[PDB]
Amino acid sequence: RSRAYTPPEDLQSRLESYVKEVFLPSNWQDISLEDSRLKFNLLAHLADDLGHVVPNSRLHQMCRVRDVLDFYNVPIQDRSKFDELSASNLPPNLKITWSY
Amino acid sequence: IGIRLTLPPPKVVDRWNEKRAMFGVYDNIGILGNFEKHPKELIRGPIWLRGWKGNELQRCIRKRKMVGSRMFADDLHNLNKRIRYLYKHFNRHGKFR
Amino acid sequence: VKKGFRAAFRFQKELERQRLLRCPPPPVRRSEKPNWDYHAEIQAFGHRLQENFSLDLLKTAFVNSCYIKSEEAKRQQLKSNQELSEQGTSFSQTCLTQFLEDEYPDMPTEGIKNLVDFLTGEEVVCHVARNLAVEQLTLSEEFPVPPAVLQQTFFAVIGALLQSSGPERTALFIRDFLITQMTGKELFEMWKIINPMGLLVEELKKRNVSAPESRLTRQSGGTTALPLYFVGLYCDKKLIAEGPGETVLVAEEEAARVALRKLYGFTENRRPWNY
Amino acid sequence: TARGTPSRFLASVLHNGLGRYVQQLQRLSFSVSRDGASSRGAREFVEREVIDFARRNPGVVIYVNSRPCCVPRVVAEYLNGAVREESIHCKSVEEISTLVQKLADQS
Amino acid sequence: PYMTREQERGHAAVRRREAFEAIKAAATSKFPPHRFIADQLDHLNVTKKWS
């Protein structure tokens, strides 16, 4: 499978719905997930629906649900620098070839 | 003339052999093995420097007094000569004294 | 064997350097070496010279006859160039003649036409074209392209410039490239004549003045094998030129060349061309 | 030393200041290695600087090869046929920028 | 000369004292330079790639 991921807007609403299944108290974006079981449940649901699972080195930075929302609102350009240089609409006098 | 005219055959080094894929396995047998062993007693080689370091003179003294009764005659004479010379040098020659 | 690998590779590169300085390869068209895409190079040629061609015209300006015929022949296993080139050479001769008539008023039409066909001659046009990278883009059948196809292509480029962006811009183009080539070049190195004193008397009679009388101004070392004679032409007690030589006859001839320059307003002290 | 090497007289290409000025460099040819340390300083020059150099004087056609080699180099082809080869192995950003500007600013 | 010796006495004392104090601060100020994490972790990119 592929890495590429771009944040759906409805994701916002999606998050709340998932939180509802595993938590009723408002100010919901500031729920604290230090209870490990609930954190696992929420993150697994988001991963299996949106096809993007949090990295190990970022799983401790996010202790509040606001941080889950913040992390899921960043895109990932899963392309080598070849594709981005090509897509940068180079001027007329520049040609790049890549032998792969 | 001090240069060749044909490239040597390109050596193939298998960087993922056995003896390269384990270099250091059990090199921490103490800090996480209840200290039963010591890495000293993992290193193969001569009986007189399994886990020991010294200069040439000390090394040859150790070779003498630890295996210098099983070593062939001419080698032993060379060794005693070497001790005599390195003694003279280390103890009477040099800039610093 | 010394164990190692660096010196072997440095030596291989040195030997290939020597072997490619000894037996250089047969020169091949720059459109068969690596790093070549035609469209980008044409557009860069346009931008280099500070003009904005019509890309279709500038593409048609390099499609010589020879390449078209050769490709047609190979197709057993496209517009032409003559039009743009003919328009270009027509405009080139007209505008060069107009320029030189404006700057130099006192020259006959034979000298002006000689200077025109020099500045559109094969050698000078080829020089400018080679040092404008035209033959790299030129399509032909034999590389290096012969001076003929090369001249035709350069004037085809000027023709496309005309038909794209106007006589005035094309005039400044010709001014910037062709007319510059007569800088430093003295007159009679461009206008190859013989027997100068004849043309001198012809011109002075056309101005209703006597045939000029020649005398000896300065003389040093008359007998030896390295003499210097100064011959001065005169026009009834007034002097119109003098010249040095190693014979009184060559001195006469070159004083004639000097006077002929002075009358035609083409001396070395002339006001430089105003760019 | 002067005697042991050639010489010349001061010269332009085509009297290159009278009518106008034409940039003498037609072409630059960068060769870089996608995965190789020696080309590191060159690699970023294809990411950061080359786009602005390409736009900053448009008469030069810039090619970049991106082969799976281990060595870079830059070929500077000029109007009058001269080819200036330059080596950029084991170099950095600022010195490669200075080199390419120096190539594109001389006959 | 402008000022007899008795007049110049100590007139530029303040300037000399502050200059010597600047010397003393410069002398006393020597110490090893700092050491940042950025240097040690930016040496770690002599193995960049494209992919």
The answer to whether A19 touches A65, Cβ cutoff 8 Å, is yes
DSSP C144-196: SPPHHHHHHHHHHHHHHHHHHHHHHHHHHHHHHHTGGGGSS--GGGTS--S-H
Tokens of B33: 């093995």
**Which amino acid is residue C184, in one-letter code?**
G
Residue C77 to residues C72, C73, C74, C190, C266: CA-CA distances in angstroms?
10, 8, 6, 49, 59
Tokens of A48: 């299996």
Instruction: List all chains that touch chain D, counting a touch as 3 or more CB pairs closer than 8 Å.
Output: A, C, E
Nearest by CB to residue D34, choosing from E46, E47, E50, is: E50
Residue with token string 């020659």 = B93
Give the method used: cryo-EM
Interior angle at CA B12, CA B10 and CA B13, nearest 5:
135
Q: In sequence order, which residues have a C-beta less than 8 Å from that of residue C63 and are 6 or more positions away?
A: C78, C79, C80, C81, C139
List the one residue out of C154, C181, C182, C45 whose CA is nearest residue C91: C154
Beta pairing partners, A96:
D64
Tokens of E3: 């000022």
Q: Is the peptide bond before C144 cis (omega within 30 degrees of 0)?
A: yes
CA A86 to CA A29: how far, in whole Å?
Answer: 40
Q: Do chains A and B touch (3 or more CB pairs under 8 A)?
A: no
The answer to whether D88 touches D73, Cβ cutoff 8 Å, is yes
Domain ranges of chain D: 1-107
Residues of D in contact with A97 (CB under 8 A): 63-66
CA C214 to CA C234: how far, in whole Å?
Answer: 6
Q: Across the interface, do A99 and D46 touch by the CB < 8 Å criterion?
A: no
Residue B8 to residues B2, B4, C18, C118: CA-CA distances in angstroms?
15, 9, 22, 61
The nearest alpha carbon in chain D to C182 belongs to D15
The answer to whether C240 touches C254, Cβ cutoff 8 Å, is no
Q: Residue A42 class from Cβ within 10 Å (0-12 exposed, 13-18 middle, 19+ buried)?
A: buried
Q: In sequence order, which residues have a C-beta less than 8 Å from that of residue E50 and are 6 or more positions away?
A: A80, A81, A82, D34, D35, D43
The nearest alpha carbon in chain D to C124 belongs to D14
The CA distance from D1 to the nearest CA of chain C, in Å, is 23
CA A6 to CA B46: how far, in whole Å?
Answer: 63
CA D40 to CA D91: how far, in whole Å?
Answer: 8
Beta pairing partners, D31:
D73
CA C53 to CA C47: how far, in whole Å?
Answer: 9
Residue A74 to residues A5, A63, A77, C8, C14: CA-CA distances in angstroms?
9, 17, 10, 52, 53
Q: Across the interface, do E51 and D34 touch by the CB < 8 Å criterion?
A: yes
Question: Exposed e or buried b for every residue in C72-111, given b needs 16+ CB within 10 A?
Answer: eeeeeeeeebeebbebbbebbbebbeebbeeebeebeeeb
DSSP D41-72: HHHHHHHTTHHHHHHHSTTSEEEE--BS-S--
List the one residue out of C89, C100, C97 whose CA is nearest residue C157: C89
Instruction: List all chains that touch chain A, counting a touch as 3 or more CB pairs closer than 8 Å.
Output: C, D, E
* Residue E50 sits at the chain A interface (C-beta within 8 Å): yes
Q: In sequence order, which residues have a C-beta less than 8 Å from that of residue B50 and are 6 or more positions away?
A: B40, B41, B43
